[PDB]
């Protein structure tokens, strides 16, 4: 029943002036599993107007379920164009106290890095479909 909140401070890999903060709340149950995932991960995002997908790519053994996130807030400075962004994790911070009202303004998707075989499968399959 107890809620935690993690702050991930991010900077754009191609422009360190462009910065973001990701606030994630979870049940303290999984707080440790979550931090481990993030510790061993890259963060990418796709902005489509008011829709913000946050891709947490993990090397960690266990890849969390998306539902372990209760709320998630993504804020950037400045505002960014629609598109894709590769972020660097600058700082992780636990401030479990989730007293602050949180806008659920993004949706996090956890995943693993893709093997060369799976990647080859897609190459084969997309070549067939799109005809390249």
């Amino acid at each position: 029943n107890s809620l935690s909140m993690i702050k991930v401070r991010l900077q754009n890999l191609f422009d360190n002036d462009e910065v973001a903060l990701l606030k994630i709340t979870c049940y303290t149950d999984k707080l440790i599993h979550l931090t481990n995932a993030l510790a061993k991960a890259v963060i990418h995002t796709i902005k489509l107007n008011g829709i913000v997908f946050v891709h947490v790519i993990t090397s960690s053994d266990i890849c969390p379920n998306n539902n372990i996130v209760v709320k998630s807030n993504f804020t950037t400075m400045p505002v960014l164009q629609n598109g894709g962004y590769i972020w660097e994790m600058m700082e992780l911070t636990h401030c479990s106290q989730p007293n602050g009202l949180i806008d659920d303004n993004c949706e996090i998707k956890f995943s693993k890095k893709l093997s060369d075989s799976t990647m080859t499968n897609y190459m084969n399959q997309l070549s067939e479909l799109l005809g390249f």
């Binding site: 995002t45 796709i46 489509l48 891709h55 629609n82 894709g84 897609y122 399959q125």
Partner: peptide
């Protein structure tokens, strides 16, 4: 129309091209 699901993580570096799109 024929569709295949792909991991949308792959679309990140197509960001600039996607941005020049009809939604």
């Amino acid at each position: 129309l024929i569709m295949q699901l792909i991991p949308q993580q792959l679309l990140t570096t197509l960001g600039p091209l996607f941005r020049n799109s009809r939604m």
